[PDB]
Amino acid sequence: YRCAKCGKEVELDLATAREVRCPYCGSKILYKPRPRVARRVKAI
Amino acid sequence: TLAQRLKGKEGRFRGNLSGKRVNFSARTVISPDPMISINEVGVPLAVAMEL
């Protein structure tokens, strides 16, 4: 389990053991989305 | 084969025996300063803490 977001928007939370496809789009390529935690960058 | 391992402009007289790779070195770029004496040199503090 994960929550990968593909090209042309959509969500697809599946696993990792068998196959990696998007049911709605029909594609197979995935970006892992950014988290929602707080990091600290200085301005220089 | 053997005669090309012994020889061949990068064999085992010039390639590995009479010219070897060494330890305790560094390599970076140069940039002037006319405030130190004639026989001193600057050394970065990153290279100075790894030698």
Binding site: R36, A38, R40, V41 | -
Partner: protein, 257 residues
């Protein structure tokens, strides 16, 4: 010692100072740049950034926004700067251009001076959230803490005798750029309150007929800010630092003996 205020405008001033000398003018000039403190954003905490720009770049623009620094509520002549921090937060969602004026401040005396600055453009469904922390600093440590600029020039007088062919061309030329000209039957005197590019025909006469004489002790000052401090407070604050700075010396000297 005397002053002559030529003009006062929003974020600019020009004046003439008399009764001083060459070393003092540089000390006054450098002090405005490297001693006067202002507030500036020093660190930004990101929660999410879906924009077209990198985290570092958005953080970099926040630091370049000039913030109002109320001089009647802290201390600008201290050797030890105050550490009071003001928090600038933002929570927006596209589409639309995000402006500097939308940043909210927890303290009404520290706000962006110019509200029409665009920070970043946002497309459909992209969110931008951050928290900015501002603190006092000096220009010598980082360029973001600069209150403005100062430029100064000598004050000179160009004497043009009427024996120079086509001297009438310089009178109209000087009048176009606003330099005062006092004319008499012997010659004319041009006061160079700003740069005076000599036209090419008169180069051979520079020194023979046309000569420049420096007026001892008078300097034309130009000070311009960006809106963080009034154009009148600046020179007063810098002078009060010099006094304080060169008094500590006397204290420290006695301690040695």
């Amino acid at each position: 010692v005397e002053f002559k205020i030529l003009e006062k405008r929003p974020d600019s001033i020009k004046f003439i100072v008399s009764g001083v000398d060459v070393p003092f003018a540089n000390a006054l000039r450098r002090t405005i740049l490297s001693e006067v403190p202002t507030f500036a954003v020093d660190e930004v905490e990101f929660l999410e950034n879906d924009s077209a720009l990198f985290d570092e770049i958005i953080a970099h623009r926040l630091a370049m926004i000039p913030l109002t620094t109320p001089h009647e509520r802290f201390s600008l002549d201290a050797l030890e700067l105050d550490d009071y921090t003001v928090t600038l937060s933002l929570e927006a969602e596209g589409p639309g251009m995000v402006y500097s004026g939308d940043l909210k401040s927890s303290d009404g005396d520290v706000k962006p001076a110019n509200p029409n600055i665009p920070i970043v453009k946002l497309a459909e469904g992209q969110r931008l959230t951050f928290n900015a922390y501002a603190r006092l600093g000096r220009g010598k440590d980082h360029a973001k803490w600069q209150p403005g600029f100062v430029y100064y020039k000598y004050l000179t007088k160009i004497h043009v005798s009427k024996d120079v062919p086509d001297w009438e061309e310089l009178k109209e030329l000087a009048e176009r750029r606003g330099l005062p000209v006092e004319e008499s039957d012997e010659e004319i005197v041009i006061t160079t309150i700003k740069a005076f590019y000599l036209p090419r025909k008169f180069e051979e006469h520079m020194g023979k007929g046309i000569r420049e004489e420096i007026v001892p002790g008078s300097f034309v000052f130009t000070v311009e800010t960006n809106g963080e401090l009034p154009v009148e407070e600046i020179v007063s604050i810098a002078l009060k630092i010099l006094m304080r700075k060169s008094d500590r010396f006397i204290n420290e000297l006695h301690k040695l003996a």
